[PDB]
Ligand binder design. Structure first.
Ligand SMILES: CCCCCCCCCCCCCCCCC[C@@H](O)O[C@H](CO[C@H](O)CCCCCCCCCCCCCCC)COP(=O)(O)OCC[N+](C)(C)C
Lengths: 56, 55, 55
């Protein structure tokens, strides 16, 4: 599995695999109104087994 | 999504109702099929000519 | 409402205010060299006005 970023309706959709159920999940990002830490907060809200997140 | 990937809880409803989806409630998966408009004749100057004719 | 979503109008409005904020904070970029001269000129003009008042 990869992490795929595509564009739908002018917004980026990023499809990442969550660990606790091992099913993918797509996140719709807003390129102006949103930040990195709100994307990581949504990523920890979707699955509670994502205690450690980082982005480099 | 109909491909099988989950849809995160920050996705708006207006982005969700542009395609089919599946709704899982406890263990039953209901295949929701919303009434969608066309996307072939959805050139925006024609959709604005529909809004102009209706108003 | 199905045109407000497929044309991505909310990001267009936020792009518009981002353009306005950038134009405002770039008009304040070429002003800060000039006020360093203007404050000097106004200071050494008030320093000569108080001379004729006390005179
Ligand atoms: C630049 C280098 C420094 C120079 C330092 C030397 C300064 C030399 C002095 C120059 C004087 C300029 C200031 C003028 C002060 C005079 C005050 C005047 O009021 O005295 C009157 C006496 O009159 C004076 O003899 C001259 C009258 C003024 C006519 C000349 C005008 C000079 C103005 C030059 C521009 C400078 C700006 C003015 C600064 C206030 C008596 O008061 P009063 O009778 O009860 O007036 C009634 C009050 N009103 C006006 C509000 C109704």
């Amino acid at each position: 599995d990869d992490v795929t970023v595509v564009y739908q309706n002018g917004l980026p959709v990023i499809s990442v695999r969550l660990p606790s159920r091992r099913e993918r999940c797509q996140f719709t990002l807003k390129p102006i109104s949103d930040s990195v830490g709100v994307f990581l907060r949504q990523l920890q809200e979707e699955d509670r087994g994502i205690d450690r997140v980082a982005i480099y | 999504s109909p491909d099988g990937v989950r849809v995160a809880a920050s996705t708006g409803i207006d982005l969700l109702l542009l395609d089919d989806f599946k709704l899982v409630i406890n263990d039953l998966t209901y295949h929701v099929r919303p009434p969608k408009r066309d996307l072939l004749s959805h050139e925006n100057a024609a959709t604005l000519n529909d809004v102009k004719t209706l108003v | 409402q199905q045109l407000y979503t497929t044309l991505c109008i909310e990001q267009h409005q936020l792009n518009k205010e981002r353009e306005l904020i950038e134009r405002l904070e770039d008009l304040k970029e070429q002003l800060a060299p000039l006020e360093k001269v203007r404050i000097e000129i106004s200071r050494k003009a008030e320093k000569r006005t108080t001379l004729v008042l006390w005179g």
